[PDB]
Design a protein around this ligand. Structure first.
Ligand SMILES: O=C(O)Cn1c(C(=O)O)cc2ccc3ccccc3c21
Ligand SMILES: O=C(O)Cn1c(C(=O)O)cc2ccc3ccccc3c21
Lengths: 327, 327
């Protein structure tokens, strides 16, 4: 039911956005169809885990409520919010695709339209909701945060001085955790009108920890999960990314090993990448990964309990989010 | 005084944005300085005619008022609004520079930050102004409009069917007129609290006409003004742009001339570009330019009078905007 509900609302948002262009922005059918296809290609394909998280938070607050004929209103709002994040994520992916000629002009334009669509859908569907101003401001701030996080990530090499766990955490927090973990949880709370009933501190902390757990797992999979299983080719080593593997390796490697790492990192050359993988393997980083992740897991599991004592319905949605991340 | 005032407020906005990053977004001095330099490079250099228009509208409404100790408040607000448009323009120019690798990653990131900065500066400087919500919504809608205009422009060739004056007007209106002419005039009215005292219809019409007059002049200069005088190399012919010259030529050229135009347009080849220039010259389009612009001038001069009979102070600022465009 959640996925079927989410797809049903997508059709509603899409029809609104496309008719608005036709009726108010003087768009020709050809461009309207081009935008329908582009919207489908960029917004549909994934697992929708950011969007579905909004539904799961709202669904937990209806079944485990702190109501009647207005249930379908909360679920609909959860779906528009879910699509705002999915469209913002779609916007970032297009931006990333430019980062790595009418095709370039169209990709840039798609990036701009996807972001503008998040505002358009909010302004229409939530037009007379009292939460509209707070929702717009939290969304925009998270978007700024992400772009700032993207700066810390893209310029993490200037070179190895910023390869620290505190800077890694700074990158994860700003680049990933705010829009991937904090925002879906917060949007599900906004639509349920249950925002001041939860400890934001514990939630922010949980979002940053789950973001950390997810990014650490993502960094490790990028290096060790083969392309057919991973879906794409792992490029963190070549790109000289400030990854969890790099910063953990640099704190436990010997001076010679660090010298060997510095001379081989950030190169497209097959043998240098293999030397890096060999160094990670030999420094028992896959073992350290298990312990770091299990220590994060202990911290996550402890904070969910603190949350459950004041906000039970919310803690069970933060538990399902965690289960998805943990597996 | 306007320019000195505008630069003084830029220093204030810049300091706010940069301190906000340092104190609230955990930014290191190195990146703060990098962003100061990028902000200066992208926002400072031009003639500031969009930004200054906001000041000139507010200045006309203080000297020709429909007040006392709150004069400096209106002028300050006019300067923050002026910088919002200058930053949005800076955002579009960066986006255009990508349209024609840490440099590409940084340009994309700069594009995102410049747009996010327009929201950040508005949310801070106008935090408890009652006009904040209306200002944010009008700004965002104009930004969407521009991206839609950029779609009509970039895909004007699909090929010659869209080379009509009504489509040219559609491109100009959405791509240029809304953010260049309508928005600065509207923002100067918002800060002066004189928005419902003016006929929006006549103003929209004037903005679209001045936008048309400016784009027609810009299109003609791109073709005939030499690179040392123009500042840059004219590429409209090569790019196969839906320019005023192209659409006017296609309505007055003979079937053979149109055939000759179609076989030569949209090519980088020096001889084909020269053939296009020769066709424009031989079809007396520089003569037609004078008559089209003078007919637009007659329409502009007539609408300013209608505006002056109800909103005199506003008409004199729309007159100065016009004088700048006309010369
Ligand atoms: O579908 C996604 O957005 C990505 N994704 C995937 C995936 O199948 O790629 C698994 C998984 C687990 C938890 C998530 C939590 C927040 C956001 C995304 C998550 C996620
Ligand atoms: O400075 C600019 O923004 C561009 N510019 C120029 C220039 O010197 O390039 C002349 C001129 C005249 C009128 C304008 C009206 C609105 C926006 C820009 C205008 C403009």
């Amino acid at each position: 039911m959640p996925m079927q509900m989410f797809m049903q609302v997508y059709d509603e948002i899409q029809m609104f956005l496309l008719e608005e262009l036709e009726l108010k922005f003087d768009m020709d059918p050809n461009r309207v169809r081009y935008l329908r296809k582009m919207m489908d290609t960029t917004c549909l394909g994934g697992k929708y885990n950011r969007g579905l998280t909004v539904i799961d938070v709202a669904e937990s607050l209806l079944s485990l409520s702190p109501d009647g004929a207005r249930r379908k209103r909360v679920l609909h709002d959860a779906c528009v919010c879910g699509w705002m994040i999915e469209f913002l994520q779609a916007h970032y992916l297009v931006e990333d695709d430019i980062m790595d000629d009418v095709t370039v002009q169209c990709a840039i334009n798609d990036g701009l339209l996807l972001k503008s669509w998040t505002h358009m859908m909010a302004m229409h569907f939530f037009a007379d909701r009292p939460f509209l101003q707070d929702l717009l401001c939290r969304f925009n701030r998270v978007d700024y945060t992400t772009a700032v996080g993207q700066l810390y990530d893209v310029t993490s090499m200037f070179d190895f001085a910023e390869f620290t766990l505190s800077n890694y955490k700074r990158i994860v927090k700003y680049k990933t955790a705010y829009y991937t973990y904090l925002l879906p949880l917060v949007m599900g709370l906004i639509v349920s009108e249950a925002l001041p009933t939860v400890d934001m501190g514990v939630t922010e902390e949980l979002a940053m920890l789950m973001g950390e757990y997810f990014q650490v797992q993502d960094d490790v999979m990028d290096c060790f999960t083969p392309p057919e299983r991973l879906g794409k080719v792992g490029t963190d080593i070549q790109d000289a990314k400030c990854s969890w593997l790099a910063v953990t390796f640099l704190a436990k490697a010997s001076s010679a090993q660090v010298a060997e790492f510095k001379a081989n990192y950030g190169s497209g050359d097959s043998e240098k990448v293999a030397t890096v993988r060999r160094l990670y393997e030999e420094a028992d980083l896959q073992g350290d990964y298990v312990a770091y992740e299990a220590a994060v897991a202990e911290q996550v599991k402890e904070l969910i309990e603190k949350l459950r004592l004041c906000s039970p319905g919310f803690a069970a949605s933060v538990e399902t989010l965690w289960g998805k991340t943990y597996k």
